[PDB]
Amino acid sequence: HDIITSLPEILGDSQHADVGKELSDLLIENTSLTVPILDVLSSLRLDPNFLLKVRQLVMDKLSSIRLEDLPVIIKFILHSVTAMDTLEVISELREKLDLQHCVSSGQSCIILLFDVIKSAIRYEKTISEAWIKAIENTASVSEHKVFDLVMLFIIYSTNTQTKKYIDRVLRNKIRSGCIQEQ
Amino acid sequence: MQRASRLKRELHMLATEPPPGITCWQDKDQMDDLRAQILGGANTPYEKGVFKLEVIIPERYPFEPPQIRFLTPIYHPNIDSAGRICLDVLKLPPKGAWRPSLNIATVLTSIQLLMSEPNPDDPLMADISSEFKYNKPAFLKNARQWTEKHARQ
């Protein structure tokens, strides 16, 4: 873990990308060491294409990850997020995330995850706008989930410029015979 | 919790320094609620009467006032046939005047004050509030006969 953390001071410039590939090799090979790898990759010097690849290679195994590590994971996803990779990751993110699955330590880090997501979405309108535009585009299915509700309440609680837009979207959603008791 | 910390000073303070003509002890029937005795105000028809009151302490007390009734029957403008008291410091703001600057003693003093001085502008009994005002002696006769059958011994 410490060697990982110290790799940026150690390695010369010819041998960044090399290490990159074989760290993605280590990533699939061990879960426990997801965090420092990620931190490392983000404190390396690399090509952004590769970083897209590994970020998907996060996302596919994200059910397998113990909750403690998720925040800094999802912080990484939302600093690797572009303006253009918004709905892509968010739709995928919005799908793969569960929050039924996780549940006394579980509840505390769920809360701390939400703190971290609050700070993400609090902190770039990029996400808020597109996040919503990704929940309204889920007016189709009667089956949109606990996260979508709790997340709406959140963006109304935090983000201010959007209040009318949340209320508009919630009213055009709720009349439609979507969100109900269940 | 707060109920305990008030009641602790109050039970102790009503055993050690209760107001004049007044006592309050933790009831021997009811070891949660308080029994008071207010002895009939001087130069009122309640002279020679010992008036028992039950003081119900609410749960969020001292954020709510005490809940007091005359258990001895009392012939009075601001007290009805079931012992209900017309008192401002028995209700919360703005209708009432309870707040934490007060305590069970200050109100039981205000009760002996109301026994001596009925208010005719908060009548529970219009017959007695009118009689009190327009035939004082008939009120004072009836309240003194009241004091001889119900507040006597």
Partner: protein, 607 residues
């Protein structure tokens, strides 16, 4: 209600017509301010809405137009209120100013999708009045350093100028800071390296002049050793150290000796200190070629800039010993050996054909620019030492014969290819200051002792138009952005003095000598030195009216109230336009006339 307020205002100034008729009725600007004032008697229902409003205004009409009058000015004036509203709820309400400054940085930080210069200048005046607040609100400042690798250069560069008053007092936060700047130095994102430089350059600047002095003189030498990694790091991140270390020197004098050796080592990696080796400098080791990506890193022209400035600074202010008396001989040797470096020295003109796809062309093109800017740093030095000594002004002529040959060569190369080569229009590094003092010496010196040396540069007409052109380049930089290129960059007062000195000579040559006396033909009629004097004059008067809004009085004092001075100056362009037009009709100078007008215009907004 508020915006209407401003539409009412703007309209009513513009015309004479409406002012007559309407008696100036209270604007909701002044009314709400009085509301804030009279919450002091402490109506504290009021204040939440006032904070709320001031922010909303700063939200809605931020400059996103800038990332006319009608879409720009009544939408400056909404937040400039916002700013005053929140400035006064902070300076009056002591209870609040925790949530106020919380919510300010809430918006300054993680944003930088929409700009926030107005928020930064709010934040600035908040903390400057009473920084003492900031010590209850450190929580946010600790999690601002969190994202101080993903925020760009200007958020961070300023956010921290504000904060640092904290880190003289608090210390746990300073062991959070250098920790964050260090962990950013070893980043992916290119901004994070430069965030590191900027936090470090400013920790070195205002974190002591020279707690205990010994726990600062060591702590500056600690971080400065971690900067010799950055002196190794990529071009841009180096560049920022050449430029920021001059202010570190001004604000922290005693680190001079250490910093000199930090640099002078970095010189010698490319300086070959033997007489009779004809390229005195190693230009081809400034150039990294890998997988046909051919980058300049360690910009040497810019290194000589920092060198040459720290040099004059040490001659003048520190002294009232061996490295600087060596560096005299270093620059004299780079002088004398570069004079006689015949393009054969650096494989140029014939051995290179600056072919801009090829690796070799990219290398040769990078080096011609390096050479050119180094020639400039040394033209400065030859001029600097001597009070107009005929040898060193002949040195200057030959250094410029170097510069100009490389310049007219890349002009011949860009006369074939498309005009996307804005790399030749990359800044001439001469300090605006020298330009000033220079052009004064060029056009405003009649002393017989100097005159033989100046008759060199004056027979040299291109050196004249070179100097001017740099005057134009610099003033333009000020127009675009809120600061100039060279030294004395962000210190407005200096800039203003130079502009005054500028005006003096620009007008002086514009007047004494007209445009009609020229003997040069059409190619030199398209850039006659008169005309460029007048255009320079143009950009000033304009830019003055952006920033230097108070001092416009002083600008004229240079050269009886505002109106007689302005009138006498108007007369000169007015008589020039008369004399321009009346004389010829055949082929009248359209552009000369055009900006005689653009001038008579600018003077007019004053009167």
């Amino acid at each position: 209600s508020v915006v209407k307020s401003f539409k009412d205002l703007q309209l009513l100034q513009g015309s004479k017509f409406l002012q007559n008729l309407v008696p100036h009725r209270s604007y909701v600007s002044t009314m709400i301010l009085e509301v804030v004032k009279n919450s002091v008697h402490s109506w504290d229902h009021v204040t939440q809405g006032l904070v709320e409003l001031g922010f909303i205004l700063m939200d809605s009409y931020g400059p996103k137009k800038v990332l006319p009058s009608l879409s720009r000015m009544p939408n400056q004036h909404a937040c400039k209120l916002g700013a005053n509203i929140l400035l006064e709820t902070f300076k009056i309400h002591e209870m609040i100013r925790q949530e106020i400054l919380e919510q300010v940085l809430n918006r300054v930080v993680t944003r930088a999708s929409s700009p926030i210069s107005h928020f930064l200048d709010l934040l600035s005046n908040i903390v400057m009045y009473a920084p003492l607040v900031l010590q209850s609100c450190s929580s946010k400042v600790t999690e601002a350093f969190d994202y101080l690798s993903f925020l760009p250069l200007q958020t961070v560069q300023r956010l921290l100028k504000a904060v640092q008053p904290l880190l003289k007092v608090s210390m746990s936060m300073r062991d959070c800071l250098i920790l964050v700047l260090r962990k950013a130095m070893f980043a992916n994102q290119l901004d994070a390296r430069k965030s590191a430089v900027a936090g470090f350059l400013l920790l070195l600047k205002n974190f002591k002049v020279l707690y205990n002095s010994v726990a600062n003189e060591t702590f500056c030498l600690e971080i400065m050793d971690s900067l010799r990694r950055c002196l190794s790091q990529q071009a841009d991140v180096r560049l920022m150290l050449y430029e920021g270390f001059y202010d570190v020197l001004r604000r922290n004098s005693q680190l001079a000796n250490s910093v000199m050796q930090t640099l002078l080592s970095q010189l010698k990696q490319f300086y070959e200190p033997k007489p009779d080796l004809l390229p005195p400098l190693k230009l081809e080791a400034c150039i990294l070629t890998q997988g046909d990506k051919i980058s300049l890193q360690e910009p040497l022209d810019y290194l000589l800039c920092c060198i040459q400035h720290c040099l004059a600074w040490y001659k003048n202010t520190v002294i009232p010993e061996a490295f600087y008396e060596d560096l005299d001989d270093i620059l004299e040797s780079i002088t004398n050996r570069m004079i006689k470096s015949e393009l054969e020295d650096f494989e140029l003109d014939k051995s290179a054909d600056f072919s801009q796809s090829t690796s070799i062309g990219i290398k040769n093109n990078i080096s011609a620019f390096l050479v050119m800017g180094v020639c400039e740093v040394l033209i400065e030095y030859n001029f600097s030492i001597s009070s107009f000594s005929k040898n060193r002004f002949e040195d200057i002529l030959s250094l410029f014969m170097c510069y100009k040959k490389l310049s007219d060569i890349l002009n011949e190369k860009a006369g074939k290819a498309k005009t996307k080569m804005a790399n030749k229009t990359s800044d001439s590094l001469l300090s605006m200051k020298f330009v000033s003092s220079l052009l004064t010496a060029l056009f405003r010196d009649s002393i017989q002792s100097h005159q033989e040396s100046l008759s060199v540069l004056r027979s040299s007409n291109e050196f004249m138009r070179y100097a001017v052109n740099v005057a134009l380049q610099k003033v333009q930089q000020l127009k675009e952005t809120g600061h100039v290129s060279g030294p004395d960059g962000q210190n407005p007062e200096k800039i203003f003095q130079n502009l005054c000195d500028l005006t003096r000579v620009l007008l002086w040559r514009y007047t004494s000598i007209p445009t009609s006396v020229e003997e040069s033909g059409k190619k030199e009629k398209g850039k006659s030195i008169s005309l460029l004097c007048l255009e320079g004059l143009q950009k000033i008067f304009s830019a003055v009216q952006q920033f230097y809004q108070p001092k416009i009085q002083q600008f004229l004092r240079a050269l009886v109230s505002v109106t007689q001075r302005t009138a006498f100056q108007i007369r000169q362009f007015q008589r020039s336009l008369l004399n321009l037009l009346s004389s010829q009709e055949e082929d009248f100078n359209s552009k000369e006339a055009l900006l005689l007008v653009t001038v008579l215009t600018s003077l007019s907004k004053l009167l």
